[PDB]
Amino acid sequence: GSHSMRYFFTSVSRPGRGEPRFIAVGYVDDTQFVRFDSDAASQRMEPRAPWIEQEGPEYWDGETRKVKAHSQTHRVDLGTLRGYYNQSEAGSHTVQRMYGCDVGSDWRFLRGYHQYAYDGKDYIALKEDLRSWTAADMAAQTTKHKWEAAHVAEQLRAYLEGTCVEWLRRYLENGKETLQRTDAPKTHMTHHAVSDHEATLRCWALSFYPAEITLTWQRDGEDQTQDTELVETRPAGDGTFQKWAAVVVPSGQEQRYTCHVQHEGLPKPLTLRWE
Amino acid sequence: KILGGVFXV
Amino acid sequence: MIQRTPKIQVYSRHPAENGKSNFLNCYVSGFHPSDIEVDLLKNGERIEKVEHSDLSFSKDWSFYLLYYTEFTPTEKDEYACRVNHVTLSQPKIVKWDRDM
């Protein structure tokens, strides 16, 4: 199928308490492989996947150098943006940055992206055409025009269509045992009595990869989305994911309900019936 | 691999 | 300034079996800003050997983190996750319910 590489940068200012916190993580699809903590001891980009650990000294020195430059750029942005919005010098603020690229089933470039946020909302984004910008507000305009004259889009486009996809492909090759795998959900239902006339039916999906999954309940066919408690898909901590969906059912009607499961790793969708 | 160059908001 | 309340899930990596090694997870997501306090509690007291994933975020910019520690579930030991965030008026305690 298709694949993505995404880098996530978060910078949080800490007035009086020295320089901002800077954290970087990299993912291929749903698997983290990179990560950097300005508060960490190493001061180096560090491996977070087995298949990236033996990449070599040049790689780690190189990502370390570049990631440090990201740290300094964001540190200055924190001040610049503070000035844009005339905000107090005592308050903590957040800059977030996400960029990456996708490749199709054939591993050819599919799309690139570069999003930027200040204090939890959109600030400026690279448009799909990789040539223009979408500015969220007044302050974004100043940055939008600045990047236009600085031909920043061109720089990013060259990265997104070149280095980004080139190394995504390299990683998919290197970590092919991990990244090019599907782990179908191991599923099951549990039954708990709420009262003497009600019961909780919970539908579980465990140990699956990638994260994408659909868990739904039906009663006699009718989707019970509005009566279903559906938790967010969560990491198990070993690279796999978990999810459940539960309904509260009148005791005695258990046979009317079915849990339906869809995942990329399933030959066909699953239908679980308490019986 | 992360982006090489420069910038400045 | 934007603020979003952390969602909290407490669960084990593997289906819990008494006496068998496992991992206690507390997954916090959808929060903003990123300053957050998370503790895993064993019988009401903080567990020292707790690690966490690297700060990441979702399509809506909201943050997520996994806090985790090795543990062996017993029939009577009680586990919880205690979370504090600017959006919470008081720290939120969520007990581990194995089953479920």
Coordinates of C-alpha atoms in Angstrom, one line a residue, chain C:
Chain C
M1 CA -5.3 30.8 24.4
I2 CA -6.4 27.4 23.2
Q3 CA -6.8 24.7 25.9
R4 CA -7.9 21.1 25.5
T5 CA -8.7 18.5 28.2
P6 CA -6.6 15.3 28.2
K7 CA -8.4 12.1 27.6
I8 CA -7.2 9.4 29.9
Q9 CA -7.0 5.6 29.4
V10 CA -5.5 3.2 31.9
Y11 CA -4.9 -0.4 30.6
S12 CA -2.3 -3.2 30.3
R13 CA -0.3 -4.0 27.2
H14 CA -1.3 -7.7 27.4
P15 CA -4.6 -9.1 28.7
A16 CA -4.0 -9.1 32.4
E17 CA -3.1 -12.4 34.1
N18 CA -2.4 -12.7 37.8
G19 CA 1.2 -13.4 38.5
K20 CA 2.4 -12.8 34.9
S21 CA 4.7 -10.0 33.8
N22 CA 3.1 -7.1 31.8
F23 CA 3.1 -3.3 31.3
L24 CA 0.8 -0.8 33.0
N25 CA -0.2 1.9 30.5
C26 CA -1.7 5.4 31.0
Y27 CA -2.4 7.0 27.6
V28 CA -3.2 10.7 27.7
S29 CA -4.3 12.4 24.5
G30 CA -6.1 15.4 23.0
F31 CA -4.6 17.9 25.4
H32 CA -3.1 21.4 25.0
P33 CA -0.9 23.0 26.1
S34 CA 1.7 20.2 26.6
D35 CA 2.5 20.8 30.3
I36 CA 0.9 17.8 32.0
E37 CA 1.4 15.8 35.1
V38 CA 0.9 12.0 35.0
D39 CA 1.5 9.5 37.7
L40 CA 0.9 5.8 37.8
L41 CA -0.2 4.7 41.3
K42 CA 0.1 1.4 43.0
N43 CA -2.2 1.1 46.0
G44 CA -2.5 4.9 46.1
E45 CA 1.3 5.6 46.0
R46 CA 3.4 6.9 43.1
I47 CA 5.4 4.4 41.1
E48 CA 9.0 5.6 40.7
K49 CA 10.0 3.6 37.6
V50 CA 7.6 5.2 35.1
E51 CA 8.7 6.2 31.7
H52 CA 6.9 7.9 28.8
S53 CA 6.9 8.2 25.1
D54 CA 8.2 11.3 23.2
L55 CA 5.7 14.2 22.9
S56 CA 3.8 14.0 19.7
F57 CA 0.5 15.5 18.4
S58 CA -2.5 14.8 16.3
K59 CA -4.1 16.4 13.2
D60 CA -5.9 19.0 15.4
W61 CA -2.5 19.9 17.1
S62 CA -3.5 18.3 20.4
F63 CA -0.8 16.3 22.2
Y64 CA -0.5 12.7 23.2
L65 CA 1.8 10.7 25.5
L66 CA 2.1 7.1 26.8
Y67 CA 3.1 6.7 30.4
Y68 CA 4.1 3.1 31.2
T69 CA 5.8 0.9 33.8
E70 CA 6.5 -2.8 34.1
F71 CA 4.2 -4.7 36.5
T72 CA 2.7 -8.0 37.5
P73 CA -1.0 -7.9 38.2
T74 CA -2.2 -9.6 41.4
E75 CA -5.8 -10.4 42.5
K76 CA -5.7 -7.6 45.1
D77 CA -3.2 -4.8 44.1
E78 CA -5.0 -1.7 42.9
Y79 CA -3.6 0.5 40.1
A80 CA -4.5 4.0 38.9
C81 CA -3.4 7.0 36.8
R82 CA -3.4 10.5 38.3
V83 CA -3.4 13.3 35.8
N84 CA -3.1 17.0 36.3
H85 CA -3.5 19.7 33.6
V86 CA -4.5 23.3 33.4
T87 CA -7.9 22.4 32.0
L88 CA -8.6 20.3 35.1
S89 CA -9.9 22.1 38.2
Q90 CA -8.4 19.2 40.3
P91 CA -6.1 16.2 39.5
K92 CA -8.1 13.4 37.7
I93 CA -7.7 9.9 39.1
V94 CA -8.6 7.0 36.8
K95 CA -8.6 3.5 38.2
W96 CA -7.3 0.5 36.2
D97 CA -10.2 -1.8 35.4
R98 CA -8.6 -5.0 34.1
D99 CA -11.9 -6.3 32.7
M100 CA -13.5 -4.7 30.8

